[PDB]
């Protein structure tokens, strides 16, 4: 199922370093990992996925204002907008309205899918969130950097290269997030799942949560549940919160 | 020694997927691959370094004109190159210069710089190389896309993301271009060389290098050797040919 990323968690408590903010709170910390998952045997989610949904559907939008996740009942990113309930040019923005120098925009979403579909070979099939000159204007710096598509024997992978991850809280709800859109991905450029790869720079857990992570290590791995997604959706933009289901 | 680049030569020989380019040349790929090195155990290059060195160099200065390599013998940029040398706004111009809305211009290689001796702790020691606006400008696009210092017990990290190899005639120039950046930059913030972390998006061998890779992978491994840098170098900007000497 999951092992490796128990193996993850597992690693950090053994080996890991030890850190302490600011604020004195206290981290166990090791850098360089890679997860990998074949979407073919179940989609890797252990147990909210409404949050992981809208999230995506929200970023595939454009859009940067909170408004659209509270309208559905999704409060994530409340505490890192202002008083209008804006984000300045996060994820949204930078997958689709990339801003440069001479008013160039670049809606990397539309181009990569459509050189997923013209150009499968492609060795740059990259949409990146790590808009240097903008991230300033950001509520936060991209978490996740940039990720990469690959395309093999009718089967479309994902890699997503992530700066830094709260192994115990986090990384369940940021695999979760790439694996579903490799699959939304997969499914409108006609081609099978393959594989999502997940890589990783500084990856922590806090020491306050040493405890619940030992206990999560010792408990019984289950199956993968099934993601399952509304076979008429031909084109990314057009999924509804009604096309997901996850089973058994 | 250098065991993990071997295994991944055998892994993209034994399980990779075959692929053919427009003009009929073949390849062998995978995708999703990590590679890590102790840096403290020695130097990761096997047996040139004259031009790793000269284009680590050219890439610190700025420079996005072949005339200072092609000044030092250096040739590897010259196919690439327009009829005045020039490549458009590839590594050099981004990790000095980086180009963006509203005049905005980064130094990159300075703030990360500063950040690593002010704020260690720091989960976004990032540069990055995709400058997605930009692209289109450049000779082609980034494969070095970007990297991620990391800070703990001293000891410096660097991490980078190759978003396509050639893991046979490529990889060992890429890898030791990085590894020797780090050490660059562990001297000039007084700290300790840690590890150089390689994660890779496509890695592909040429099936006309498939005589040649198996003969790699049957050859008895060598000591790795030593790199010494001049330790009277305390600026990423001042460092010479001479400052370095690779060793056993």
């Known amino acids: ?35 990998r998952y074949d979407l073919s045997k179940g989609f890797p989610l252990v147990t909210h996925l409404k949050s992981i949904i809208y999230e995506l559907l929200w970023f595939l939008k454009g859009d940067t204002n909170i408004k659209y996740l509270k309208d559905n009942g999704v409060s994530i990113w409340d505490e890192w907008a202002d008083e209008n309930g804006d984000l300045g040019p996060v994820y949204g923005a930078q997958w689709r309205s990339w801003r440069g120098a001479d008013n160039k925009v670049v809606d990397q979403i539309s181009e990569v899918i459509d050189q997923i579909k013209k150009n499968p070979d492609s060795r740059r099939l990259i949409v990146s969130a790590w808009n240097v000159a903008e991230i300033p204007n950001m509520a936060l710096a991209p978490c996740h950097a940039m990720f990469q598509f690959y395309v093999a024997d009718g089967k479309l992978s994902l890699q997503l290269y992530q700066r830094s991850a709260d192994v115990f809280l986090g990384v369940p709800f940021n695999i979760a997030s790439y694996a579903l859109l490799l699959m939304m991905v ?63």
């Not at 597992?10 to 990992?33: A, E, M, P």
């Not at 019984?220 to 997901?244: A, G, Q, R, S, T």
């Open 1 to 35: 199922h999951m092992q490796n990323y128990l193996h993850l968690l597992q690693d950090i408590l053994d080996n890991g370093s030890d850190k302490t903010d600011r604020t004195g709170t206290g981290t166990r910390s090791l850098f360089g990992y890679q997860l």
């Open 186 to 248: 997969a499914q409108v450029t006609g081609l099978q799942v393959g594989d999502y790869v997940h890589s990783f720079g500084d990856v922590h857990i806090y020491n306050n949560h040493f405890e619940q992570v030992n206990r999560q290590l010792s408990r019984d791995p289950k199956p993968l549940p099934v993601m399952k997604l509304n076979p008429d959706v031909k084109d990314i933009f057009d999924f509804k919160f009604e096309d997901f289901e996850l089973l058994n």
